């Protein structure tokens with residue numbers, strides 16, 4: 001396999017959970033991640049790891065105490081759904097030896113599970129008194145100095161609940177609607193901003209994560225988001241990875257509003273093309289999405305996540321059932337974006353036998369400039385990676401069929417590698433393809449759903 | 461002085477010329493560069509280095525042969541205005557030794573100085589026959605292989621001239637008007653595109669430049685522009701620098717049209733604030749500029765260049781007569797953008813003494829998160845750099861007067877450094893400032909033109 005200079009290895013993200021998945025994940029995470037690292041996964045998005053209101057039953061999004069990573073006895077348990085902090089720290093060390101960066105699912109927008117009610121003057125009853133043992137232990141003046149503030153999480157830490165404002169509050173400068181659920185956190189209050197900057201430092205520099213997936217971040221004040229990202233980046237030696245879950249109509253607008261070069265965003269709109277792909281009738285010449293937009297460099301592409309694919313389909317999203325490998329090929333091999341392999345696809349749906357080779361194709365071959373194919377048809381999409389002049393053996397000519405016909409079809413494509421012989425890394429088409437002196441070869445693809453993708457890369 | 465980690469040192473650019481300046485620059489450049497390296501200049505925008513139509517009298521923008529860097533006798537001289545290519549290579553070696561990156565001023569849009577005319581069938585005479593001895597010497601099949609194409613630069617390498625298209629030609633997809641001057645090069649021709657890629661690799665990997673100032677590039681086909689940048693970036697092991705001279709009304713839309721993360725652009729709009737500043741009557745609360753836009757991270761800021769500041773004022777631009785040190789402070793110490801120090805200001809106008817301390821202020825202290833100041837007045841702008849937690853002694857509190865009243869005014873500002881004693885690195889205000897437990901100090905600034913900027917930094 002071609003050997004890539006480490007600093008140039010493509011980042012391939014793996015979402016290491018789906019809904020209700022993997023109770024006790026932390027203990028098992030080293031084993032799960034060992035083969036994934038061999039394939040070419042270089043980062044995993046872990047489920048929200050902080051204590052949530054429903055204890056071991058919580059997936060993590062009903063977050064209670066951001067400073068309690070399965071360490072303190074609260075909400076009925078010490079461990080989270082996934083395990084104790086010790087098991088998490090050992091998981092992080094294992095992933096570290098394996099070369100994998102772990103991203104934290106931070107839930108900034110809301111809190112749930114108050115320890116007691118309060119009477120808020122001029123308002124009434126609210127579930128706003130939060131005790132937060134983990135905060136008491138780690139958010140101390142000794143640890144954080146200038147970022148430490150003596151204040152209690154009660155109703156003055158929140159904008160409000162049930163889309164009603166608490167006295168003297170306002171929702172903030174939010175790109176989406178401000179209120180989603182729970183007790184909406186007031187990031188217009190200075191002491192909360194500073195504590196969150198301290199927590200971001202703790203997660204990277206002390207706990208040992210390498211980046212964040214930012215839950216519902218478009219419901220959160222945009223100025224705080226920018227200032228917290230900017231603070232954590234300046235505060236860390238590594239280049240920390242930030243990806244927004246900004247599930248809005250205009251994700252380009254959201255990124256321009258936050259206005260930090262460190263923030264990426266999930267490509268929600270590219271999925272609509274995979275929805276069309278699943279029909280088996282999509283015109284394979286047209287592709288939209290963030291990854292073909294003026295923010296394409298800041299795109300994090302995916303096929304499904306725990307909201308889009310979930311038993312019962314609770315958010316009513318159209319499903320991506322068919323042609324899923326062609327969808328994964330599209331996100332994995334093209335030059336732009338950081339792609340996400342979804343655990344439910346790899347694991348539960350059992351797509352690992354075919355996905356394994358696509359992760360390797362991205363890992364060891366998808367390098368050099370990218371080229372679109374003037375010869376795309378209504379039924380076949382093709383794409384080229386030149387490869388690396390420095391690394392002979394890189395480059396790829398990929399083809400995907402959006403039809404279930406049977407048989408093959410071939411396309412004359414310029415690989416930009418003269419007089420080079422290729423072969424199909426996927427094992428879907430047999431034989432070789434030899435290019436001519438100007439770089440062109442005749443590459444086939446199978447016109448089926450089940451095997452309708454091919455990734456031709458140069459022979460050893 | 462604070463010791464900044466090598467990979468974190470701010471980029472500070474110096475445009476190493478102005479109009480008609482420095483005949484024989486190459487021999488004198490290492491001498492000029494050594495003290496500037498000490499102050500903190502890290503990159504130098506060098507004048508267009510390729511042979512021009514006007515020989516030793518060519519600043520370099522009437523470019524004739526891009527492969528002739530002063531190595532071949534054509535246009536009446538072997539050496540350019542700035543020297544031989546031997547003397548250029550020696551200057552680049554010395555810059556390497558000083559840790560200074562060199563940026564090549566590439567002139568892609570047009571050619572001038574045709575050797576003979578051609579009778580274009582169905583058009584008439586045109587000055588299109590380019591002999592190009594440098595191209596004969598270096599653009600060879602043995603040197604470049606796949607990128608080498610056998611063709612001569614005659615009328616079929618250009619789109620037209622005098623805003624008139626040649627037969628079969630179109631102007632291309634250009635953001636600005638396509639025609640500026642000379643023989644407009646056809647970048648919609650494959651062979652011309654492929655040759656320019658070869659040349660880009662040559663400049664970086666063989667001559668030893670580190671980046672590019674892209675002349676008149678809004679007039680050049682946007683798709684070539686993106687493809688060239690991306691090709692050169694992939695073909696270079698180092699992180700190559702690219703700044704566009706896109707002198708258009710909507711620089712944001714230009715950078716979105718080219719759509720590569722590697723391209724920066726000059727912030728022409730911010731200069732309009734410095735024109736206002738120069739009057740002595742600017743409202744210092746208000747600032748525009750690309751550096752304050754959604755493309756701020758891709759801004760290259762400056763006060764003047766060889767087009768805006770020139771004897772005779774050839775393009776009718778308003779001049780920044782006064783408050784020039786305040787302008788420089790503004791572009792040098794704020795967190796976004798890469799700033800440019802102009803040789804005409806440093807040298808001819810004698811600003812070196814004061815610019816020396818503001819360059820050192822950027823090199824050594826301008827790190828960590830930036831913060832705007834809520835208490836800006838019509839007369840005073842202020843701004844804070846929080847500094848680095850890992851490097852004690854960094855950070856700064858800058859203020860700039862836009863008034864010439866005399867005396868001093870003090871401003872209560874959060875420096876984000878508790879219990880810290882500051883002093884004015886510019887020496888314009890005597891004494892020290894001591895911040896309280898929460899980081900706030902009372903920072904003075906002189907209300908004058910000639911001394912009205914202060915840059916408070918931590919005592920050592």
Ligand SMILES: C[C@H]1O[C@H](O[C@H]2[C@H](O)[C@@H](O)[C@@H](O)O[C@@H]2CO)[C@H](O)[C@@H](O)[C@@H]1N[C@H]1C=C(CO)[C@@H](O)[C@H](O)[C@H]1O
Nearest residue numbers: 061176180181215216217219245247248249306307315
């Ligand atoms: C579940 C999901 O809901 C919201 O997303 C909606 C978008 O706002 C809309 O644009 C709409 O078109 O569809 C989306 C689904 O209705 C919300 O904005 C998202 O942040 C949210 N996803 C995360 C939020 C959670 C915490 O409240 C979790 O429940 C969820 O699993 C997260 O992925």
Ligand SMILES: C[C@H]1O[C@H](O[C@H]2[C@H](O)[C@@H](O)[C@@H](O)O[C@@H]2CO)[C@H](O)[C@@H](O)[C@@H]1N[C@H]1C=C(CO)[C@@H](O)[C@H](O)[C@H]1O
Nearest residue numbers: 521522567636640675676677705707708709766767775
């Ligand atoms: C000198 C300058 O001319 C053009 O610039 C104009 C802009 O296009 C307009 O938007 C307008 O506002 O004013 C500008 C000045 O008239 C052109 O676009 C620029 O590229 C050009 N600058 C470079 C071009 C040259 C030719 O190679 C050189 O003469 C000049 O020194 C370069 O800096």
